[PDB]
């Protein structure tokens, strides 16, 4: 009946003076916009249909046309920024917010979805949706004693839309909006649906991606233990944002990092640092690098959890981007660590894989490794065991690499190399 209409026919129906003809044409547009391949979004926009769709959102008397026009506009808004803008420019934002209070669940859900796409476009539209007052009615839909009574698809859509209100920076979302949303986010983070958990973690990862004050707003809510639990989930779509959030948190103060350690996070890293998904190993190693940039007692916990051999492992064999994070973890470790801690690193076999990476065609990692070697020598001086270290470096082919780096096409590289040779070799 409404399958594969031309845009011309859709226009004719929508321009008819007949609400039922309008409904059928709107449904025809929804089906076009919902097809698997290449929905004709620009053709619909060019036909001038958005303002009509927007006016149909207000037809309380005809719930089906509210639904079809909400779905059509959702799909237009799912496109490029320019396509999303066309929807906003038609006055869709307050019209969708009004539909949040609809007695028809499928309609309120579609309005949730549409606002998710609008907010998802970026900071400006996110903040505009917030200024039109979306947060109160969105949160009201979740004000039930038990989230399990809500339809699953419905809850997933709400969680996703709330995550887009938390998303993006320059600027970050308004502080008052974040405070308003957080208690519901905390509740969603404890829900048992894998998709809700994933999107809740994404939201938290967005909120902790910023300065220490933003991190603190989240940590103060007491979510770190739950994040660490999710860090151990079997589902990769949960582990990914949980790990990102944890990694963000440890970029904060030492006290914020300590909450992550206190919550048991380090016990998960044997698995994360050997995870078959390269992006998990990379993010886990980056996270370690920010833990080893912490206090000596925090470095000590890394030691106690047996994580130094795992860092040696990643340095020895991993995707290059991961090996680079490992190099950072080592340099941070060697900068902040005690002599005994630094010695331990050598006993775990750090020297040979460090030296092997000096043959890398990346100027930054070389500088990073050179700094580590310097820091390790410094601890060796305090023990009068410089020569023993020099031999280790010589035996594994390290001296050949450092000596060659004196003739390197970079000032900082050459200087650090020549200094090492003309002081220990």
């Amino acid at each position: 009946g409404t399958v594969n209409w031309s845009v011309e026919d859709i226009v004719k129906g929508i321009n008819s003076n007949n609400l039922e003809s309008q409904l059928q044409a709107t449904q025809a547009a929804r089906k076009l916009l919902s097809r698997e391949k290449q929905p004709p979004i620009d053709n619909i926009i060019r036909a001038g249909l958005i303002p009509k769709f927007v006016s149909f959102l207000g037809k309380t008397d005809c719930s089906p046309i509210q639904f079809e026009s909400a779905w059509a506009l959702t799909n237009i808004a799912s496109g490029t920024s320019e396509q999303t803008k066309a929807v906003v420019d038609g006055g869709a934002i307050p019209a969708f917010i009004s539909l949040l209070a609809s007695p028809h669940a499928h309609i309120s859900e579609q309005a949730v979805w549409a606002l998710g796409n609008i907010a998802g476009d970026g900071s400006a539209f996110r903040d505009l949706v917030i200024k039109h007052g979306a947060i109160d009615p969105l949160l009201a839909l979740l004000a039930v004693p038990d989230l399990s009574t809500l339809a699953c698809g419905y809850l997933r859509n709400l969680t996703w839309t709330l995550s887009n209100l938390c998303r993006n920076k320059n600027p970050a979302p308004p502080l008052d909006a974040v405070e308003q949303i957080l208690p519901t986010l905390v509740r969603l983070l404890h829900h048992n649906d894998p998709e809700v958990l994933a999107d809740s973690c994404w939201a938290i990862s967005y909120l902790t991606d910023g300065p220490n004050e933003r991190i603190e707003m989240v940590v103060k809510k007491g979510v770190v233990p739950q994040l660490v639990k999710l860090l151990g989930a079997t589902e990769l779509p949960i582990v990914t944002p949980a790990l990102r959030a944890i990694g963000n948190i440890v970029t904060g103060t030492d006290e914020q990092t300590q909450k992550v350690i206190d919550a048991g996070a380090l016990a998960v890293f044997p698995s994360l640092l050997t995870n078959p998904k390269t992006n998990i190993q990379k993010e886990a190693t980056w996270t370690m690098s920010n833990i080893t940039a912490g206090r000596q007692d925090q470095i000590q916990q890394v030691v106690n959890h047996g994580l130094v051999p795992f860092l040696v492992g990643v340095l020895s064999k991993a995707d290059f981007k991961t090996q680079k994070e490992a190099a950072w973890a080592i340099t941070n470790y060697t900068s902040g660590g005690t002599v005994e801690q630094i010695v331990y690193l050598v006993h775990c076999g750090i020297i040979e894989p460090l030296m092997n990476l000096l043959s890398a065609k990346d100027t930054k990692i070389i500088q990073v490794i050179l700094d580590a070697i310097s820091n390790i020598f410094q601890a060796a001086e305090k023990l009068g065991e410089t020569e023993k270290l020099s031999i280790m470096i010589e035996e594994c082919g390290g001296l050949d690499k450092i000596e060659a780096l004196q003739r390197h096409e970079n000032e900082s590289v050459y200087k650090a190399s020549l200094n090492l040779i003309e002081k220990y070799f």
């Binding site: 440890v250 970029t251 980056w286 950072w328 902040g336």
Partner: peptide, 5 residues
């Protein structure tokens, strides 16, 4: 020496 994103 923390490094953000």
């Amino acid at each position: 020496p923390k490094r953000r994103r």
